[PDB]
Design a protein around this nucleic acid. Structure first.
Ligand SMILES: Nc1nc2c(ncn2[C@@H]2O[C@H](COP(=O)(O)OP(=O)(O)OP(=O)(O)O)C[C@H]2O)c(=O)[nH]1
Ligand SMILES: Nc1ccn([C@@H]2O[C@H](COP(=O)(O)OP(=O)(O)OP(=O)(O)O)C[C@H]2O)c(=O)n1
Ligand SMILES: [Mn+2]
Ligand SMILES: [Mn+2]
Length: 1264
RNA sequence: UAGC
């Protein structure tokens, strides 16, 4: 550690709260990090005096593996294939030797890549060589699934931990987290690597580079080492940052060692990934004595996902685990994978927890962070053959006699059918009828929005489309000479802009390009990038599904972020006396096929949409005539609407299937088109469509099937009390059945058990394998709940992992900084120990803040000041002589965050500056007699501040674009969007109108006329950048670093004029004995105190924020939040109604609607969150789990604590000020470590009137 | 070639 201490000494102290932070120390540490060689990190690791408790037997078979050759073969189709040994799954990268297939590197002599000799032979066609290349390429691919070299994460850990225990400001004592000599993962990482390198000077087992991956030329290396080491690094860091229990951590190291020990690391990891969850989470409290769980009320209407805390629910034996015991299967699983030692130890400990509290949920949490975090990987060929193969087993087919004759491509489900499809057809027909009945549906704007949905900078199988068209002799414009990426649906849009639907129809049957996705703890999944025509024709399906989800069921449309997965619902569902069944349908996409679902859905839509769409086109598609054979004998032609014409063509595609074109870059010679009946995932229908069928079938069960298949009085009662509108929440193939409890306690376990079994049997009837889980736990959208307590699953957020499906290289340097920051926020949302996490993050950041730059022998260095990270969100540990750890990780981001920490130590800063020579005669309103201008330039605070706001990736704009083709393109884009003359006309009105009532007031008028321009830029920025464009980006960051400044942003200089008074601590909003999120307990002071004082966010953030906008959606390309800002800004700038009416017309609204909304906007009382956008203030993501709405409303007093002040009074017409002011008060409160306090407006320098004009100036100047 |  002397090697680490000597080199990072001062820095270590600055991030441990012993000494102040400063850019000089920081940048020097950065330079030290940059000059540490890989092998030096292993040397540093050797200096560590590991304890015996940190050691465990390392399996010798981890080093001696067979040849890859016996693990592959060539099939009847000549494609290289993985040869199965452990079962159908055994398709991943096998654990084998690899050195025998390498050629030493020219320079890094001890490292090697795949023999170029082997590849050429493979490219020739040699079977043995192909096998070898494939294994070589996939093994490498498995190794690329990480953010950067493992040594950087390790080094930062060394630096951070060299600081020793941290003193808690609140608890007023040092934490007791074991030091590194007790870190078992680290010991393994060192020993495993040392054993491989052996007598070699190079200590790294492999090198993660740009030129690819290189293996250390040791006969001891294995294709399983990269995954293994990556797993150990994650555990190593968490044992120190999440305060994980070391005894548990060793259990996780064992599974991993067993994984590398097996014949296929990934396969093994996959087959055992439920060990920790099963022997802890899903087995808690078989016995229960005490503890408290939340008591929540689900407000009406349940669709709002809005809840209210009502105190605590005392627990007792009355609530012990009633769900079936998983013991048997659990022990079996352990026995089958040689892990019965671990499974047993876990069962033993789980039984010792007889009280529900912080301690026990922390144990579950700790247990679950130990699961491997690797992104499983296998060759494309295999994913495609394993995912587009299985077909649903419809145990009860829809009788052939139940269909009418054809009506084009569809057949009507006779209403005489006794098939369960009867009800599936009803829901969709009904929905379709109501959707097409809506006036909005026929509005030129809505149809424009729809048509813009799939016009994105993403792929759409462009090549296959261009050739399907060529087959009918139709050539698309090539826009030869444009600097935009051609494989964008945006490019596609332009090529089709001026072509009749009848000419592009054939494209609906074009092939589909390959697209893949690797996931943590899951198998890779293939994706279907549908083309514009295919997406167009899919509309009716998508809209009818949306109509169902919005009006007929209880469903969520969530993303991937924890902030949007409705946490409140899980707390409710899992709190006794409530119970929940976690439903999931396995092989969902393979389950939605023509034979049952699609052939019925198409018919339903096509018929329920008939009368309202009659005699009308839709989204570009024309009406037409189709052959009719419904009735027997009677065979005529039928006039169908454009909307119907879509279903007509879509039905044709759903019937034929999809031609998945597989170009496997990992398996030489594996080129082939595979036809599959699996449902498309890249379809705009996918998600919404699966959510609708889900709830529809559940409705049919509870309402029809169920009741008809059982006379059990209780099961019938339980069922009757369940409605899909109140008790069943779902998204996609995920379902959460919430059985509310009574005063008599919870519903009988045996009656629930009976119910479930009927659901299972019910699904076999239409080819759906329900994966039902009834274990006392609530699990929805990978969010884990128990007794009202949310259990973060850390294993799913690998600190070093990163998905990399394609062979393409990682993004140039700067890019990694955004990834590092994301790692930090995860740690916040996941509840890691705040001080330990913040310190490590500073280590990690410093370690990635410097990059070597080239300009042609002009070897300089790019360096981000420590201040840039603050701008990005990382809280300061100690600065300007302040006390240590006064800043919380809930500190806002950007300007709002800068204002907050600076406001919290204004005096401190001023005093410090003066005491160091930065004195002046001019008294600053904010910093008194401090020479802040000279100070902030010298500390690189201004520099860091501005550098933070610069693009972290190369810009492609500015590439030479021959004006003429440049105009042809944006024209086609325009035509696509401006298909319907009525819409264009709407915008032209908005324009001439704008020139009379709005032009001049603001300068950001959003307009549909901009979209074509934004679309072009998007297609541009999607293209690969040049080394030149890369040099330009550096120069930019480096120019801002040289430049010196005299102020911050106009907005921030305004916030600084506002002073506050921090007061008495708030009272608890929830019981302090109440577990809400494992990890957030009295051992994690700041996160905890904030949780208790501020309160948890009990409403769905998606539903909440949807209430802060006048318009939900707009044409893709424009920003709903932008539009909201312009309208409110015009109003604040005193613009006339007519002016707002003009803006709305420029974005697509019909005058009637425009004038109505404009008039409505004018008189509304806009809420804090919505109003604060006029000045670009946004609720920090980190705050999303807290009740920020209460804070704004009841704990940020704008009335000075001691009465009215002249400066504090708010001018009549400047009420909007109060909203901006609220964000500033909360910003300081949330940034201050400890309990939320009540902050009181103390002062506004030039007064509120001056402040308002100041903000108005910024407003009217945006975009000039 | 890399989707919603
Ligand atoms: N349409 C669509 N749905 C997605 C996507 N990613 C996830 N989902 C949906 O949300 C669900 C949760 O998926 P996961 O893949 O577990 O993502 P995650 O939510 O980020 O998991 P984590 O807990 O580790 O943060 C599965 C699926 O129905 C995506 O890219 N597109
Ligand atoms: N990047 C992703 C990931 C998932 N999905 C969609 O999510 C849906 C179901 O989610 P999973 O449960 O994750 O997929 P399954 O195929 O059902 O997994 P398996 O039975 O193990 O659960 C189907 C799939 O198309 C998607 O469109 N895009
Ligand atoms: Mn599933
Ligand atoms: Mn699912």
């Amino acid at each position: 550690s002397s090697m680490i201490l000597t080199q990072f000494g001062p820095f270590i102290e600055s991030i441990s709260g012993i000494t102040d932070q400063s850019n000089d120390v920081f940048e020097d540490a950065a330079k030290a990090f940059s000059m540490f060689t890989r092998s030096d990190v292993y040397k540093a690791l050797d200096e560590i005096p590991f304890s015996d408790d940190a050691m465990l037997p390392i399996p010798p078979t981890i080093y001696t593996k067979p040849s890859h050759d016996s693990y592959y073969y060539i099939d009847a189709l000549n494609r290289v294939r993985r040869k199965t040994y452990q079962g159908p799954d055994d398709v991943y990268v096998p654990n084998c030797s690899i050195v025998e297939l390498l050629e030493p590197h020219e320079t890094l002599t001890s490292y090697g890549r795949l023999s170029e000799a082997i590849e050429n032979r493979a490219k020739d066609g040699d079977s043995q060589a192909r096998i070898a290349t494939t294994y070589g390429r996939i093994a490498e691919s498995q190794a690329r699934q990480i953010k950067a070299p493992l040594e950087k994460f390790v080094l930062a850990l060394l630096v951070a931990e060299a600081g020793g225990s941290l003193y808690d400001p609140v608890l007023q004592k040092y934490d007791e987290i074991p030091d590194l000599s007790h870190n078992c993962p680290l010991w393994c990482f060192r020993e495993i690597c040392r054993h491989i390198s052996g007598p070699l000077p190079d200590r790294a087992p492999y090198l993660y580079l740009s030129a690819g991956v290189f293996w250390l030329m040791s006969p001891r290396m294995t294709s399983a080492i990269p995954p293994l080491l990556s797993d150990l690094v994650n555990l190593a860091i968490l044992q120190q940052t999440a305060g994980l229990d070391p005894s548990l951590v060793k259990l996780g190291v064992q599974i991993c060692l067993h994984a590398a020990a097996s014949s296929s690391y990934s396969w093994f990891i996959l087959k055992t990934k439920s060990i920790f969850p099963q022997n802890t989470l899903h087995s808690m409290y078989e016995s229960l004595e005490g503890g408290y769980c939340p008591n929540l009320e689900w407000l009406e209407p349940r669709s709002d996902y809005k809840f209210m805390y009502m105190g605590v629910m005392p627990l007792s034996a009355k609530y012990a685990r009633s769900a079936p015991s998983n013991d048997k299967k659990a022990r079996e699983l352990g026995e089958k994978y040689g892990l019965s030692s671990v499974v047993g130890e876990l069962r033993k400990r789980t039984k010792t927890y007889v009280k529900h509290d912080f301690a026990s949920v922390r144990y579950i949490r700790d247990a679950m962070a130990c699961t491997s975090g690797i992104f499983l990987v296998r060759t494309p060929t295999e994913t495609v053959l394993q995912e587009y193969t299985q077909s649903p087993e419809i145990k009860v087919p829809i009788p052939q006699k139940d269909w009418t004759g054809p009506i084009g491509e569809i057949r009507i489900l006779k209403d005489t059918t006794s098939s369960i499809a009867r009800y599936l057809y009803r829901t969709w027909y009904l929905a379709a009828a109501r959707m097409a009945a809506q006036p909005r549906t026929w509005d030129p704007l809505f149809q424009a929005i729809m048509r813009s949905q799939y016009v994105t900078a993403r792929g759409g199988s462009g090549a296959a489309l261009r050739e399907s068209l060529y087959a009918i002799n139709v050539s698309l414009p090539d826009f030869k000479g444009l600097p935009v990426k051609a494989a964008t649906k945006i490019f596609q849009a332009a090529q089709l802009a001026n072509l009749p639907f009848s000419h592009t129809s054939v494209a609906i049957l074009a092939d589909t390009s390959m697209g893949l996705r690797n996931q943590v703890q899951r198998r890779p999944r293939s994706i279907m990038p549908l083309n514009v025509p295919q997406q167009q024709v899919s509309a009716p399906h998508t809209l009818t599904a949306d109509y169902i989800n919005y009006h007929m069921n209880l469903s969520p449309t969530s993303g991937s972020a924890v902030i949007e997965k409705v946490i409140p619902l899980g707390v409710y569902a899992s709190s006794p006396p409530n119970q929940s069944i976690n439903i999931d349908i396995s092989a969902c996409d393979a389950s939605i096929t023509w034979d049952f679902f699609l052939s019925v859905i198409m018919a339903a839509i096509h018929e329920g949409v008939a009368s309202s769409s009659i005699g009308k086109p839709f989204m570009g598609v024309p009406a037409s005539i189709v052959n009719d054979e419904s009735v027997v004998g009677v065979r005529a032609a039928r006039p169908i609407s454009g909307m119907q014409n879509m279903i007509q063509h879509l039905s044709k595609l759903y019937k034929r299937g999809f031609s998945y074109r597989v170009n496997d870059s990992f398996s030489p010679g594996n080129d082939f088109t595979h036809m599959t009946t699996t449902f498309p995932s890249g379809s705009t229908a996918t998600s919404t469509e699966h959510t609708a069928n889900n709830s529809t079938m559940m409705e049919t069960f509870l309402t029809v099937w169920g009741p008809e298949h059982t006379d059990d009085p209780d099961v019938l009662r339980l069922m009757k009390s369940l409605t899909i509108q109140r008790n069943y929440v779902c998204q996609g193939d995920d379902g959460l059945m919430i059985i509310d409890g009574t005063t008599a306690g919870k519903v009988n376990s045996e009656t629930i058990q009976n119910d479930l079994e009927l659901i299972s049997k019910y699904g076999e009837e239409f080819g759906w394998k329900y994966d039902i889980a009834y274990d006392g736990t609530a699990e929805y959208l990978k969010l884990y709940f128990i007794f009202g307590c949310r259990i973060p699953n850390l294993s799913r957020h690998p600190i070093v992992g990163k998905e990399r499906a394609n062979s393409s290289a990682e993004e140039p340097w700067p890019a990694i900084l955004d990834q590092i920051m994301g790692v930090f926020f995860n740690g916040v949302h996941d509840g890691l120990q705040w001080q330990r996490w913040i310190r490590y993050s500073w280590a990690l950041c410093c370690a990635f803040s410097r990059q070597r730059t080239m300009i042609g022998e002009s070897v300089g260095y790019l360096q981000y000041p420590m201040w840039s990270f603050v701008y990005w969100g990382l809280p300061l540990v100690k600065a300007f002589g302040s006390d240590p750890w006064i800043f919380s990780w809930y500190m806002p981001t950007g300007d709002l965050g800068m204002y907050s920490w600076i406001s919290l130590i204004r005096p401190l800063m001023t005093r410090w500056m003066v005491a160091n020579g930065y004195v002046t005669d001019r008294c600053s309103t904010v910093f008194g007699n401090a020479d802040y201008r000279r100070c902030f330039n010298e500390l690189k605070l201004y520099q860091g501040y501005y550098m933070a706001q610069l693009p972290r990736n190369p810009k492609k704009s500015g590439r030479a674009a021959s004006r003429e083709v440049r105009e042809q393109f944006t024209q086609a884009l325009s035509d696509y969007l401006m298909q319907n003359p009525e819409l264009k006309s709407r915008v032209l009105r908005g324009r001439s109108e704008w020139e009379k009532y709005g032009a001049g007031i603001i300068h950001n008028p959003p307009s549909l006329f901009d979209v074509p321009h934004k679309w072009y830029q998007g297609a541009q920025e999607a293209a690969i950048a040049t080394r030149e464009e890369l040099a330009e980006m550096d120069e930019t960051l480096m120019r801002a670093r040289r430049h010196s400044y005299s102020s911050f942003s106009k907005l921030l200089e305004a916030y600084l004029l506002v002073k506050w008074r921090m007061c008495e601590a708030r009272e608890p909003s929830v019981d302090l004995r109440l577990p809400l999120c494992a990890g957030i307990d009295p051992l994690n002071s700041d996160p905890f105190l904030k949780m208790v004082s501020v309160g948890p966010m009990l409403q769905s953030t998606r539903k909440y924020f949807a209430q802060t906008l006048f318009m939900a959606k707009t044409v893709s390309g424009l920003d709903v939040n932008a539009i909201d800002s312009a309208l409110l800004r015009l109003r604040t700038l005193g613009a006339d109604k007519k002016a707002l009416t003009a803006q709305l017309l420029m974005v697509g609204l019909q005058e009637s609607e425009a004038d109505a909304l404009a008039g409505k906007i004018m008189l509304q009382d806009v809420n804090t969150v919505q109003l604060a956008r006029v000045v670009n203030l946004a609720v920090p993501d980190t705050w999303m789990s807290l009740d920020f709405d209460s804070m704004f409303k009841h704990h940020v007093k704008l009335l000075p604590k001691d009465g009215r002040h002249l400066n504090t009074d708010i001018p009549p017409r400047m009420g909007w000020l109060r909203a901006i002011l609220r964000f500033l008060g909360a910003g300081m409160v949330m940034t201050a470590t400890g309990v939320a306090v009540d902050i009181y407006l103390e002062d506004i320098h030039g007064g509120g009137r001056s402040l308002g004009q100041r903000f108005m100036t910024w407003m009217r100047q945006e975009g000039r």
